[PDB]
Design a protein around this ligand. Structure first.
Ligand code: HEM
Ligand SMILES: [Cu+2]
Ligand SMILES: [Cu+2]
Ligand SMILES: [Cu+2]
Ligand SMILES: [Cu+2]
Ligand SMILES: [Cu+2]
Length: 153
C-alpha cells in the first residue's frame, strides 16, 4: 500500500509521460512485443508490423498506445480509488481480449523499463519502487475484478 509520498512520486513521473503520451506508448509496445513475442498474438491487428521502424510508423499502433496510457493515467491519478475506472477495463480484457494477469506483469515491466530509459533522474529507486507498488495495486485489483466476471487468467 502506498504512502502519500509514493503517490506523489508516481504522479510526478506520470507528468513526464504526459509530455509525450504517443511516444512513450510506442516505446512501451515495442519493448513489450520484443521481450514477450507471445503478447503480440493477443494484439491481433498489429501482427503485420515486422520491424521496429514499421511499429513506429503505424498510426494505428500509436493511437492505440495513447488510448492505453490515457486509461492507465486516469487510474493512477485516483491513487487507489479506481474501482469506477478499473471495471470497464476488467470487463473488456477478461471477457473480450482475454488477457492473463501474466501479460499485465509483462506490460508493467515494459512501462518501468521505458520510464527508466527516458528519465533516470526523475526515476531512481524510490520512484521506481512507488511505480512498482502502483502497478502491483492495479494488477491485484484487476485480477479480483476478472474473477468476479468468471475469468481465471
Ligand atoms: C496497463 C495495462 C493495460 C491498460 C490500461 C489497457 C487499456 C486498453 C484500453 C483502454 C483499450 C481500448 C478499450 C478496451 O478494449 O478496453 C485496450 C484495447 C486492447 N487491449 Fe489493453 N490495456 C492494458 C494491457 C494489455 C495487454 C498486456 C494486452 C495483450 C498483450 C492487451 C490487449 C488489448 C487488445 C487485444 C485490445 C483491443 C485492441 C484493438 O483491437 O484495437 N491490453 N487496452
Ligand atoms: Cu518519459
Ligand atoms: Cu497495447
Ligand atoms: Cu475509494
Ligand atoms: Cu537500465
Ligand atoms: Cu522532476
Amino acid at each position: 500500500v502506498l504512502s502519500e509520498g509514493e503517490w506523489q512520486l508516481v504522479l510526478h513521473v506520470w507528468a513526464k509521460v504526459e509530455a509525450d503520451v504517443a511516444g512513450h506508448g510506442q516505446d512501451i509496445h515495442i519493448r513489450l512485443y520484443k521481450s514477450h513475442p507471445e503478447t503480440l498474438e493477443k494484439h491481433d491487428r498489429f501482427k503485420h508490423l515486422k520491424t521496429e521502424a514499421e511499429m513506429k510508423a503505424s498510426e494505428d499502433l500509436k493511437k492505440h498506445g495513447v488510448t492505453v496510457l490515457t486509461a492507465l493515467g486516469a487510474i493512477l491519478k485516483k491513487k487507489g480509488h479506481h474501482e469506477a475506472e478499473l471495471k470497464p477495463l476488467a470487463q473488456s480484457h477478461a471477457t473480450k481480449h482475454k488477457i492473463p494477469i501474466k501479460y499485465l506483469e509483462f506490460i508493467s515491466e515494459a512501462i518501468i523499463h521505458v520510464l527508466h530509459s527516458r528519465h533516470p533522474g526523475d526515476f531512481g529507486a524510490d520512484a521506481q519502487g512507488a511505480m512498482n507498488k502502483a502497478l502491483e495495486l492495479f494488477r491485484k485489483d484487476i485480477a479480483a475484478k476478472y474473477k468476479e466476471l468468471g475469468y481465471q487468467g
